[PDB]
Amino acid sequence: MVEAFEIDSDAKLTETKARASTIDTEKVLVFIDHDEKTIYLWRGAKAELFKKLMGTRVAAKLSHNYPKYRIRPITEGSEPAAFLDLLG
Amino acid sequence: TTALVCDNGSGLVKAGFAGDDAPRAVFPSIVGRPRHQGDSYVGDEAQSKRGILTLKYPIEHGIITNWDDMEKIWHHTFYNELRVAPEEHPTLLTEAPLNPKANREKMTQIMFETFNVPAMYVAIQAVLSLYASGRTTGIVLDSGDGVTHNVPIYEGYALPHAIMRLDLAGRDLTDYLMKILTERGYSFVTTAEREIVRDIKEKLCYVALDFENEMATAASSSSLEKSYELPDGQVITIGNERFRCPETLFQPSFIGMESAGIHETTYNSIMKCDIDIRKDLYANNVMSGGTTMYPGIADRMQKEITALAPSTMKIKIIAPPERKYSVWIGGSILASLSTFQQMWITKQEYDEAGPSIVHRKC
Numbered sequence: 001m002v003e004a005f006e007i008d009s010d011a012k013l014t015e016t017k018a019r020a021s022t023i024d025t026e027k028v029l030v031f032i033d034h035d036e037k038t039i040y041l042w043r044g045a046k047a048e049l050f051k052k053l054m055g056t057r058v059a060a061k062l063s064h065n066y067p068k069y070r071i072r073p074i075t076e077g078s079e080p081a082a083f084l085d086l087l088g
Numbered sequence: 089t090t091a092l093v094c095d096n097g098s099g100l101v102k103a104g105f106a107g108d109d110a111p112r113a114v115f116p117s118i119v120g121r122p123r124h125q126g127d128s129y130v131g132d133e134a135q136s137k138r139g140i141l142t143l144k145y146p147i148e149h150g151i152i153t154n155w156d157d158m159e160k161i162w163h164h165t166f167y168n169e170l171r172v173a174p175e176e177h178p179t180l181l182t183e184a185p186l187n188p189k190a191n192r193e194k195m196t197q198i199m200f201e202t203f204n205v206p207a208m209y210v211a212i213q214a215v216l217s218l219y220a221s222g223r224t225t226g227i228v229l230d231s232g233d234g235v236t237h238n239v240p241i242y243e244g245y246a247l248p249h250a251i252m253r254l255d256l257a258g259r260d261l262t263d264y265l266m267k268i269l270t271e272r273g274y275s276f277v278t279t280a281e282r283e284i285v286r287d288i289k290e291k292l293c294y295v296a297l298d299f300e301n302e303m304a305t306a307a308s309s310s311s312l313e314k315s316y317e318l319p320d321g322q323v324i325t326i327g328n329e330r331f332r333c334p335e336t337l338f339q340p341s342f343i344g345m346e347s348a349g350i351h352e353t354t355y356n357s358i359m360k361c362d363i364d365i366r367k368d369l370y371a372n373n374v375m376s377g378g379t380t381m382y383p384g385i386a387d388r389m390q391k392e393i394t395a396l397a398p399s400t401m402k403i404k405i406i407a408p409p410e411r412k413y414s415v416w417i418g419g420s421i422l423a424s425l426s427t428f429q430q431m432w433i434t435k436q437e438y439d440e441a442g443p444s445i446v447h448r449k450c
């Protein structure tokens with residue numbers, strides 16, 4: 001299973017559906033891959049500094065739920081293949 | 089209630105108000121004294137009398153080394169340049185990478201006990217420049233007047249074990265240009281003549297993409313030679329000195345240093361970082377500081393880094409137009425973030441813990 005969230009411009013954490021079209025250059029996103037015990041912190045190319053800073057903080061708090069999962073910050077345009085397969 | 093931002097460089101102070109687009113006050117980091125009888129003048133007032141005064145730089149290679157004179161610069165910054173009372177304003181200051189812990193404590197002690205600031209914070213210069221570029225991960229080349237650093241930064245925090253320091257920067261380049269100008273018969277020696285050569289350096293120097301070919305074709309080159317008008321109206325002409333001067337950054341042996349060049353220390357810095365973050369560093373090489381202003385430096389860096397990095401590696405050199413002040417602008421951005429207000433060290437907390445608190449909150 002896999003979940004997906006979004007860090008808003010007003011700091012909230014909101015759930016979103018976790019495939020293909022959710023990617024957009026101005027968002028910072030988090031995807032939890034339970035099979036691989038991995039928390040992906042995805043940043044878009046045009047993500048403003050303060051969502052990136054808070055995306056780091058959101059990933060860390062979600063990681064309190066899964067303290068032995070791997071946290072992997074990734075960036076638009078150079079994501080790992082495992083992440084790409086995860087969504088499409 | 090407005091925060092102050094002060095970036096104390098070896099050569100220039102950049103100071104202003106958090107939220108301004110750029111530093112309101114840019115002035116030399118000097119204290120001048122008259123020779124006779126063995127008072128003082130600070131900043132612009134020292135240079136306006138550069139003749140009758142002996143100059144001291146309180147910051148050497150980015151490190152504060154003369155604390156009495158540093159106090160004068162801070163007092164000058166607050167009262168004469170910014171025209172504020174420091175006890176009324178939270179104050180963000182900057183420091184060099186690898187600044188010794190005792191220096192950070194002393195800075196804090198002075199801010200709270202001498203200037204009575206209500207709150208303060210000290211940030212690493214290169215980290216601020218990365219933030220100003222919109223990144224929390226990358227490797228910064230920060231080259232100013234007195235020191236050059238390679239600083240890898242991951243998810244908001246510098247990796248000190250991988251930081252490189254190079255005691256080679258703008259002032260050494262000016263001194264070298266003075267030296268090689270003797271080949272055309274030009275003598276620049278005095279403090280004031282050094283300032284002229286600094287201006288020549290800034291207006292006419294550039295980094296060659298292929299230094300060896302630039303030298304070999306310098307003779308046949310029509311457009312290499314440039315003229316420069318001195319204050320007195322006299323004109324000088326220089327040629328391959330234009331690019332031999334900043335070539336020193338890539339070949340420090342030009343001034344008798346056997347340190348590696350900034351391309352190699354960038355590579356060495358990345359190679360001290362974990363394999364899994366090197367790709368993020370290669371793709372986010374951010375340049376900052378006045379000595380990264382030379383035309384051609386980004387393209388030369390791209391070329392050199394590409395030859396050292398893995399063949400498939402994505403390499404990107406970012407040279408923002410504002411990089412002469414990006415450290416300051418980063419501090420303005422940081423000190424204006426609503427989330428940063430918890431990061432201030434308050435006078436209350438200093439009175440409880442003492443200067444040691446700076447290691448915990450900064």
Ligand SMILES: Nc1ncnc2c1ncn2[C@@H]1O[C@H](COP(=O)(O)OP(=O)(O)OP(=O)(O)O)[C@@H](O)[C@H]1O
Pocket residue numbers: 096097098099100101147149150231232233234235236257258259286289290291376377378379380381382412
């Ligand atoms: N256009 C330019 N071309 C080349 N060099 C420049 C240019 N503009 C400024 N410089 C050089 O940059 C230096 C000042 O830059 P900066 O203010 O970043 O240094 P600093 O922060 O005071 O020093 P440091 O960071 O090393 O303590 C001077 O040596 C100056 O000659």
Ligand SMILES: C/C1=C/C(=O)O[C@@H]2C[C@@H](CC[C@H](C)/C=C\CC1)O[C@@](O)([C@@H]1CSC(=O)N1)C2
Pocket residue numbers: 099100115116117118135138233258259260262263282283286
């Ligand atoms: C316009 C300006 C540029 C600068 O970077 O100035 C700084 C600070 C300056 C202090 C002495 C000078 C007489 C006073 C003011 C010049 C400040 O020394 C420098 O010029 C030194 C000496 S030459 C050089 O390249 N760096 C750098």
Ligand SMILES: [Mg+2]
Pocket residue numbers: 096097098213232233377415
């Ligand atoms: Mg500096």
